[PDB]
Write an enzyme that holds these catalytic residues in place. Sequence first.
Site, mmCIF file in Angstrom:
data_model
loop_
_atom_site.group_PDB
_atom_site.id
_atom_site.type_symbol
_atom_site.label_atom_id
_atom_site.label_comp_id
_atom_site.label_asym_id
_atom_site.label_seq_id
_atom_site.Cartn_x
_atom_site.Cartn_y
_atom_site.Cartn_z
ATOM 1 N N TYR A 16 14.068 -46.936 -39.689
ATOM 2 C CA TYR A 16 13.321 -46.288 -38.630
ATOM 3 C C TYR A 16 14.259 -46.133 -37.443
ATOM 4 O O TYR A 16 14.666 -47.132 -36.849
ATOM 5 C CB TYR A 16 12.098 -47.110 -38.301
ATOM 6 C CG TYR A 16 11.106 -46.406 -37.436
ATOM 7 C CD1 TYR A 16 11.443 -46.028 -36.136
ATOM 8 C CD2 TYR A 16 9.833 -46.116 -37.881
ATOM 9 C CE1 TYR A 16 10.564 -45.340 -35.347
ATOM 10 C CE2 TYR A 16 8.910 -45.457 -37.055
ATOM 11 C CZ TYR A 16 9.288 -45.089 -35.771
ATOM 12 O OH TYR A 16 8.392 -44.479 -34.897
ATOM 13 N N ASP B 256 22.017 -49.998 -35.133
ATOM 14 C CA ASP B 256 20.766 -49.821 -34.385
ATOM 15 C C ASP B 256 20.178 -51.178 -34.178
ATOM 16 O O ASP B 256 19.653 -51.750 -35.104
ATOM 17 C CB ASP B 256 19.800 -48.942 -35.175
ATOM 18 C CG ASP B 256 18.444 -48.786 -34.502
ATOM 19 O OD1 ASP B 256 18.137 -49.493 -33.539
ATOM 20 O OD2 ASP B 256 17.669 -47.893 -34.943
ATOM 21 N N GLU B 257 20.289 -51.709 -32.961
ATOM 22 C CA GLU B 257 19.788 -53.021 -32.661
ATOM 23 C C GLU B 257 18.678 -52.890 -31.674
ATOM 24 O O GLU B 257 18.470 -53.774 -30.855
ATOM 25 C CB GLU B 257 20.878 -53.963 -32.196
ATOM 26 C CG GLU B 257 22.008 -54.120 -33.192
ATOM 27 C CD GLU B 257 22.742 -55.448 -33.106
ATOM 28 O OE1 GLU B 257 22.340 -56.270 -32.254
ATOM 29 O OE2 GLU B 257 23.691 -55.674 -33.918
ATOM 30 N N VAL B 258 17.876 -51.828 -31.834
ATOM 31 C CA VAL B 258 16.704 -51.591 -30.962
ATOM 32 C C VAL B 258 15.611 -52.632 -31.204
ATOM 33 O O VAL B 258 14.918 -53.038 -30.265
ATOM 34 C CB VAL B 258 16.158 -50.153 -31.138
ATOM 35 C CG1 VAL B 258 14.806 -49.993 -30.480
ATOM 36 C CG2 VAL B 258 17.154 -49.173 -30.543
#
Lengths: 439, 439
Positions: free
Chosen positions: A140, A241-243
């Site tokens: 995602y 992606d370290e959201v």
Amino acid sequence: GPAMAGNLYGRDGAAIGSLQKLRFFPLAVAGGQGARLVEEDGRELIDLSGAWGAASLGYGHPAIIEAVSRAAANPAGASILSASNAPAVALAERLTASFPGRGTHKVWFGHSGSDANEAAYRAITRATGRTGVIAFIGAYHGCTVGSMAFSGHSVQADAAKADGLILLPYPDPYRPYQDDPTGDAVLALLKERLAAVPAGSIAAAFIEPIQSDGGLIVPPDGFLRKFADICRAHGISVVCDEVAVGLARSGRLHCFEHEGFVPDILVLGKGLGGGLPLSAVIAPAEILDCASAFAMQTLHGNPVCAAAGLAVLETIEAENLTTAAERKGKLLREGLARLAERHELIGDIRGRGLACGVELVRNRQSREPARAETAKLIYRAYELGLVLYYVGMNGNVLEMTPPLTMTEDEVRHAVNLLDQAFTELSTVSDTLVSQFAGW
Amino acid sequence: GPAMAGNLYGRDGAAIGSLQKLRFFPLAVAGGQGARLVEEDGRELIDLSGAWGAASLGYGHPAIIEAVSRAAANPAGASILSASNAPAVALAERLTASFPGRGTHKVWFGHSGSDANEAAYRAITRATGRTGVIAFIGAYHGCTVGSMAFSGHSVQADAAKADGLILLPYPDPYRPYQDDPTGDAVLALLKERLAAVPAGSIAAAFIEPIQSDGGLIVPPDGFLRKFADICRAHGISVVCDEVAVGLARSGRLHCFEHEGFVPDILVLGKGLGGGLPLSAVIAPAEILDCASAFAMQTLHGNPVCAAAGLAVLETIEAENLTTAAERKGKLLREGLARLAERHELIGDIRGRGLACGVELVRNRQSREPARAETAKLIYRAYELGLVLYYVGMNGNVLEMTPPLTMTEDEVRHAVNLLDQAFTELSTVSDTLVSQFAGW
Ligand SMILES: Cc1ncc(COP(=O)(O)O)c(/C=N\[C@@H]2CCCCNC2=O)c1O
Ligand SMILES: Cc1ncc(COP(=O)(O)O)c(/C=N\[C@@H]2CCCCNC2=O)c1O
């Protein structure tokens, strides 16, 4: 009828379109303190989801109050586009200082994970003149046209995809692709797919170091390192992606610290803002300086949002939250292991720090996903005063991403509420759970 | 060298990538009070741009301070996605109540104009199963893949465009398409273009009721009404983008009130947030309820941003800012008319309320755009302590969108600084202005 339609939840139905809603039970919030939410009627709940990871410091944390009030009373304008501003510059300085690329990288600021992934992709393709991108099924990366283009999760399954997109299976130790618990089969696939395209046509690779909404999947040991090696062999930029899983949540500051590689680009979001919309891309200079007036919205880098970000990073230091997430994660995972001794539905427990997933199965041998059971479980948790949701391509992973400030006693108590939810999930009828659309 | 590189502006260069920058002069802000910005060295400036319209209530307005501090200290969670929350619901209630569609419409919340335009388009196409869209050359609708798809401005000129996009000339009384100051020629073109596509293939029409970044263009009288009629004749949804020119700035609450039509969809942004990222789409129920979990980001509808929005709307009432924008706009436009008696460069003065544009020309007969002169003018204004920028497809319209709270004395004084900028623009060298990339 009218009393229910008149309450905060029923008003939500009447005023707000369903387009952006992801609802599992009628949670209707009017306040918040610590790790507690407070509904319109005054009922308190423990927020195990921590607003999906955004409430990094919980609700009403003194540091966020102070920084946001200060910034409100004396803002350095409202934007980074046509002015430098002091809080955004100091934030950008602190973020690049946290990253191993301190010497070579700069920051872009956005409002959300979607914004930020979208920018990174656009920047890589602009810098490079190539369109191709690798990402993962289950991944995602956003819910905007530009970010759904290289996402792999169900939410984006109908979306237009990027020309030259290659989607790979994300290697799940619990359900390993080609029965290979190492993930090497995925790497072999990647190489085979790469041999079928023109040399140098792929510019970017997106990866979650733990896949969050695709089902809290910690990839096999060594997989990400070896994946990054391949990318590097083909001159492909690795975007991490370290959201969901960044900034202390994993028990290291940056989740990639667990995984023996450094990404070319790091994407941050959710908890960076502490409840306010904030995101960032930390990337090589030549990537973010390849154009100007290119990826811009009016309120990008506004000082209230940048002050909130500085508050979050400062609190990560002051309260030693990287260690606290490690310590409390262990505790949480141990409580869950005790739950698995009592409830056969628990098929797997996984995660790092306070990014934890519990996978529910109809039978432990078959691993058949228990989708209906998961949906009722969280409904019964909500009734009991515990907020958490499920994720995953099979609807069957309980996600736990509480505020990094959640106390050890709150953890203990969340596990006990969870225990009772397991004991009581079939008290929730099919008709009741059916009222909520979920994913 | 090092002192300059070490200051806030030079630090901005080192830390923040140029990707999102739109810079015309080295403005470097550390605080703000009222309609004033305060640079790192303490120098004060009057912000005629009002952060491009976002600083609707100026800087450090008591209402924004109070609402944001209150919301920070006691937030109703952090999002509207998986919970209803009290501030977002009350905001959505107040916005739909302001709109003539109160009985039939709902709200979606976003972080920016781009987000919001993107959502509306996606929602119309989803509801309708059609892809086609009408928009205007010069139209700035966003800087994300989904919003640039039907934009017409230079910034989006390289972007992938929507299948079935029809771009029309926006009718400029100062440079009228086919020499027709009524705009009927554009309407005739539209009809001709529509006769060449399959019946019912166009779902949406985007319009700015004043085109802002395309050059502060107030369209000819009756044009928008007649445009909406055509759309309605073909069952096409009219989306009015009031991200720049909405919520009291035009001297009516909603800019379309000047134009004898009501849109199907209204898009709001910038000043709605008062310095915080906030946007909204007000649209028919059946459009925003056609799906769920469809256009969603984690922090959409967060209570701090929603409280700021309620503060802005409440202040629009308390301080009667719709009338104040009308009154002060007239004053501003009168001061500018006096400037035109002294400076031949002024070719045209236009706008409504506190959305004002001044078009600069090398000769008043030819109307040749004065691009170089405009760029130096704003540079010399900045030196003198006045912030404003230029827009337009020819680089030659000064834009003025100050906070709606700017005093009459500040207006008077901005005009005098402007007067001196005109008198002194060629004191700015080519080499100095060349350092800034602008658009
Ligand atoms: C009419 C209109 N509609 C949509 C937008 C997009 O808003 P966002 O920059 O918040 O995404 C804009 C936004 N901004 C432009 C361009 C870059 C920043 C300065 N001001 C603008 O109006 C707009 O003017
Ligand atoms: C790994 C990862 N990368 C990017 C994003 C997108 O962030 P935004 O929702 O702020 O646009 C997400 C965001 N959100 C999902 C889906 C809907 C809301 C709940 N939580 C999520 O993680 C994410 O998990």
